[PDB]
From a paper:
RIFIN, a large family of Plasmodium variant surface antigens, plays a crucial role in malaria pathogenesis by mediating immune suppression through activation of inhibitory receptors such as LAIR1, and antibodies with LAIR1 inserts have been identified that bind infected erythrocytes through RIFIN. RIFIN also mediates immune suppression through activation of inhibitory immune receptors including leukocyte-associated immunoglobulin-like receptor 1 (LAIR1) and leukocyte immunoglobulin-like receptor B1 (LILRB1). Notably, human monoclonal antibodies that contain LAIR1-domain insertions in either switch region or between V and DJ regions have been isolated from donors, who have had malaria. To define the structural basis underpinning interactions between wild-type and antibody-inserted LAIR1 and polymorphic RIFIN, we investigated the overall architecture of three types of LAIR1-inserted antibodies, determined crystal structures of LAIR1 in complex with the RIFIN-interactive regions from two RIFINs (PF3D7_1040300 and PF3D7_0401300), and used the resultant structural information to derive a LAIR1-binding signature and to identify RIFINS from diverse Plasmodium species capable of recognizing LAIR1.
To gain insight into these three insertion architectures, we determined structures for all three types. Despite differences in architecture and flexibility, RIFIN binding capacity of LAIR1-insertion appeared similar as assessed by co-IP and electron microscopy (EM) analyses of a chimeric MGJ5/MGD21 antibody in complex with RIFIN.
Residue numbers in the entry:
A (entry chain H): 1 to 348
B (entry chain L): 1 to 216
The structure:
């Protein structure tokens, strides 16, 4: 039931403050780093804040520095983001995420038989372009099939050509005669000694010459391969933080007059522009709803002003353009504003 | 200031194979940055898929798997099924303060309808709105598939970016998408130039409409 629930989001005028809360469940909160990641509407993910297990150390993206602080309470079993001096761009949905650290350590898994296999590269893990490299895969004596996998399963090489090398061990060799940049990447050995398969090898990194590799040893994640697996295991569903200098406001309606850019075939596009209102919804009908076919009202826009705008368009024949009347019925119930306006061919 | 770049939109046939890149502005993406990959679907939380460039989870099928490719981390889909239509984000670990930089994202669309080029309709400012000391050009985009469009606005033939405001694509009843773009001008800028144009680019297919001040 590992879970994170965010709350405390809401609607604030710029310069105000909020505190987001994120209650953890189904795991030991005390033990992992925790981060806040925001997503502004219609855009991607931005990391906001990072906090330690005990609250010792923490940092913030530069945008929110000095305005946002991050904290946690293991007794209350939850994560807090205090958001002071809110700006407009701070509007987003805020998510709570469980960071993972060097869980890629010397021993993170444990398995009894069958004994997991070992992988080797000769002459090394760094190879010149166009040269030879061989993967040596070692496992128990009496292996039936030995497979060298690449990053994706289905990219792999199985073999029955296994050699017993020691009284206890047999190996298989997979050679690459001339290295391609498509050869570089992650490899891992597995074996089928019947009845069922093996645990998988460790990962191995192959690189073309141009780099320097000191692959890894007992010091797990130590330096160049800093503590990572930062795979943000668990994500909440966030809360909406809305920052707006905007009040209730009826819209102003303008006629989008059928222009010479009438769509070809005796069908023009009448339109009705619903400009600068707040908040949604706005409902649009034509001729008291007597016209349905051809009508397309659009998604509204959120303008830098903080006000919404909208457009309602109906395709309609031109012999019709001559004769009868075409009227917008625009209804903004948040301001109890109702506007009727006849769209017309322009005099010109 | 560090920037991580991935393709804005990509399209696949049911059963196909796609690869999504993730480019560090530092110039190169090694395994020491330990890339990670996530998808986000409507209504449900960001799920996590790949870590340390290739490491998989319980919920991720072997259809999904990533690698490093051409200085950029990559995610390779296989036997792409319609359930996979989502947005996909990558993650890089620059150790130190501010250690996390996300990628822009990739809206992956799985084709269930044939590609529809967009219908663009462009309106001049109204005679009423101009008298109110304001000017708004209205560019309306409907009935396209996939829901990935790029909009740019043109003064006479030069480009203009200020006062542009564009919606995000939104599915219609027909399961095709629709979007709007509003260029905001002063009446002076409007009457100033020969014409103003709206370019709707949709799958390498650019459609440019025009309206003129010298109208009526």
């Amino acid at each position: 039931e590992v879970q994170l629930v965010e709350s405390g989001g809401g609607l604030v005028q710029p310069g105000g403050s909020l505190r987001l809360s994120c209650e953890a469940s189904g795991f030991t909160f005390s033990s992992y780093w925790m981060s806040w990641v925001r997503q502004a509407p219609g855009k991607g993910l931005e990391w906001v804040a990072n906090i330690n297990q005990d609250g010792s150390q923490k940092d913030y993206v530069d945008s929110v520095k000095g305005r946002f602080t991050i904290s946690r309470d293991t007794a209350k079993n939850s994560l807090y983001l205090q958001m002071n001096s809110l700006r407009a761009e701070d509007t987003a949905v805020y998510y709570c995420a469980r960071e993972r650290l060097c869980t890629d350590d010397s021993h993170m898994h444990g398995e009894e038989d069958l004994p997991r296999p070992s992988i080797s590269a000769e002459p090394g893990t760094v190879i010149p372009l166009g040269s030879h490299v061989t993967f040596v895969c070692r496992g128990p004596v009496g292996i039936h099939t030995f497979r060298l996998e690449r990053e994706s399963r289905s990219l792999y090489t199985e073999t029955e050509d296994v050699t017993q090398v020691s009284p206890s061990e047999s190996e298989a060799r997979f050679r690459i005669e001339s290295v391609t940049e498509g050869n570089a990447g992650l490899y891992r050995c597995v074996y089928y000694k019947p009845p069922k398969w093996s645990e998988q090898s460790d990962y191995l990194e192959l690189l073309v010459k141009g780099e320097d590799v000191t692959r890894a040893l007992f010091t797990h994640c130590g330096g160049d391969g800093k503590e990572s697996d930062y795979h943000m295991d668990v994500w909440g569903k966030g809360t909406t933080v809305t920052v707006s200098s905007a009040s209730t406001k009826g819209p102003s309606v303008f006629p989008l007059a059928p222009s010479s850019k009438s769509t070809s075939g005796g069908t023009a596009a009448l339109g009705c522009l619903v400009k600068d209102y707040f908040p949604e919804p706005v409902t649009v009908s034509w001729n008291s709803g007597a016209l349905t076919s051809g009508v397309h009202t659009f998604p509204a826009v959120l303008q830098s002003s903080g006000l919404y705008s909208l457009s309602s368009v109906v395709t309609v024949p031109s012999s019709s353009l001559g004769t009868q009347t075409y009227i917008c019925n625009v209804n903004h119930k948040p301001s109890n504003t109702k506007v009727d306006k006849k769209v017309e061919p322009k005099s010109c | 200031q560090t920037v991580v770049t991935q393709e804005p939109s990509l399209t696949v046939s049911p059963g196909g194979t796609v690869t999504l890149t993730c480019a560090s502005s530092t110039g190169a993406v090694t395994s020491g940055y330990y890339p990670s990959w996530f998808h986000q679907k409507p209504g449900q939380p960001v799920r996590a898929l790949i870590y340390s460039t290739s490491k998989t989870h319980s919920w991720t099928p072997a259809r999904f798997s990533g690698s490093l490719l051409g200085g950029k981390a990559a995610l390779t889909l296989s036997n792409v099924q319609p359930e996979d239509e989502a947005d996909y984000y990558c993650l890089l670990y620059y150790g130190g303060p501010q250690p996390w930089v996300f990628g822009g994202g990739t809206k992956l669309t799985v084709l269930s309808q044939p590609k529809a080029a967009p219908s663009v309709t462009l309106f001049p400012p109204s005679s009423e709105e101009l008298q109110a000391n304001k000017a708004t050009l209205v560019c309306l985009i409907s009935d396209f598939y996939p829901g990935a469009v790029t909009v740019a606005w043109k003064a006479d033939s030069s480009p203009v970016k200020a006062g542009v405001e564009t919606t995000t694509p939104s599915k219609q009843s027909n399961n095709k998408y629709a979007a709007s773009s509003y260029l905001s001008l002063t009446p002076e800028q409007w009457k100033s130039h020969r014409s103003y144009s709206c370019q709707v680019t949709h799958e390498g297919s650019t459609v440019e409409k025009t309206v003129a001040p010298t109208e009526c």
